[PDB]
Write a protein that binds this DNA or RNA. Structure first.
Length: 90
RNA sequence: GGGAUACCAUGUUCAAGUGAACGUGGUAUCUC
């Protein structure tokens, strides 16, 4: 595992729909010699699960995704969630 | 000259589960 394609597919393909909405926030103090990149993978309801903090920007992106991908049971739960939804708000 | 972050213009391709990332041209710091 530990790959982009696999992650983006899981999170975006497996999870994510018309409703809800999860994002990725990148925060770090990137230095010429010493680089760092954290990524907060949260969801509309304010739930953070995918936190990938690597050395560069990429590993951060792919690291965060992978972090969430570690919660397969969660991704599925969400999947059934996005489907179970009664297609409404109030 | 090898490499990395950052930025701007733009494109390829990977998977084939289905959706996305990097590359590349050049500027710049730094680094080896």
């Amino acid at each position: 595992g530990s790959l982009d394609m696999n992650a983006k597919r899981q999170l975006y393909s497996l999870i994510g729909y018309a409703s809800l909405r999860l994002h990725y926030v990148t925060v770090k103090k990137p230095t010429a010699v010493d680089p760092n990149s954290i990524v907060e993978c949260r969801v509309g309801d304010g739930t953070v699960l995918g936190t990938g903090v690597g050395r560069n920007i990429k590993i951060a992106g792919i690291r965060a995704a992978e972090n969430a991908l570690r919660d397969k049971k969660m991704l599925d739960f969400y999947a059934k969630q996005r489907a179970a939804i009664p297609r409404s708000e109030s």
